[PDB]
């Protein structure tokens, strides 16, 4: 739908939509920018991620409200409306996964871009897994696991332990272990090892990099406090 707008204009409008908290618009603008076919910069990758995380985040929050109402009840209306929200959520995840597969991931050769996109792929398969109940649920879970695992392997080889994308990836893979894979011990071990190895690398950082890394380390600490 954005095919007639300039790439630079789509990016500019994505930033405006973020300021206006219009995340559906922001996601559509960034989808249009990706579909121009050029690789994305660090800043542009962040705009893409922020837009879709906010869209799906609102859908996930609504799905959880409705799923809770449905469970307490168990006419067709609650189930029907939960299904409607679920289908919309699945469509957004499918859209993002399609952008990553056509063709963001295959063109991503640098560690920072490839890990960023593979973490996204793991995240959106995780969101699909949160609502999955049918015969493909196990395959959805393994698709999330596989994407996270490839991202982990690259990040451990190519990035310092304090790198924010490496930290965020480990955080989210640990949430996957805890909430999706029913592996809370793996979740806790990954969070602890990630935190400890980041702590030992902080001495290498500037004040601004220190701030970036310790922010995400605190989220690891918050989860360990919740889980232990």
């Amino acid at each position: 739908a954005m095919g007639s707008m300039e790439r630079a204009s789509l990016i500019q409008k994505a930033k405006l939509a973020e300021q206006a908290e219009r995340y559906e618009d922001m996601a559509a603008f960034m989808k249009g920018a990706v579909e121009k076919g050029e690789e994305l910069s660090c800043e542009e990758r962040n705009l893409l991620s922020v837009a879709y995380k906010n869209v799906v985040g609102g859908q996930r929050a609504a799905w959880r409200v409705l799923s809770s109402i449905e469970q307490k009840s168990n006419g067709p209306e609650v189930r029907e409306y939960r299904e409607k929200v679920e289908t919309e959520l699945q469509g957004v995840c499918d859209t993002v996964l399609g952008l990553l597969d056509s063709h963001l991931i295959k063109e991503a050769g640098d560690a920072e871009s490839r890990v960023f996109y593979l973490k996204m792929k793991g995240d959106y398969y995780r969101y699909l897994a949160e609502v999955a109940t049918g015969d493909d649920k196990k395959r959805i879970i393994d698709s999330a696991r596989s994407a996270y695992q490839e991202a982990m392997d690259i990040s451990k080889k190519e990035m310092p332990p304090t790198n924010p994308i490496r930290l965020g990836l480990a955080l989210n893979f640990s949430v996957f272990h805890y909430e999706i894979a029913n592996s809370p011990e793996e979740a806790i071990s990954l969070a602890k090892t990630t935190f400890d190895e980041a702590m030992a690398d902080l001495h290498t950082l500037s004040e601004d990099s220190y701030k970036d890394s310790t922010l995400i380390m605190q989220l690891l600490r918050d989860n360990l406090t919740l889980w232990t």
Partner: peptide
């Protein structure tokens, strides 16, 4: 319930 990455 747990925290995944956020801005």
């Amino acid at each position: 319930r747990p925290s995944s990455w956020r801005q």
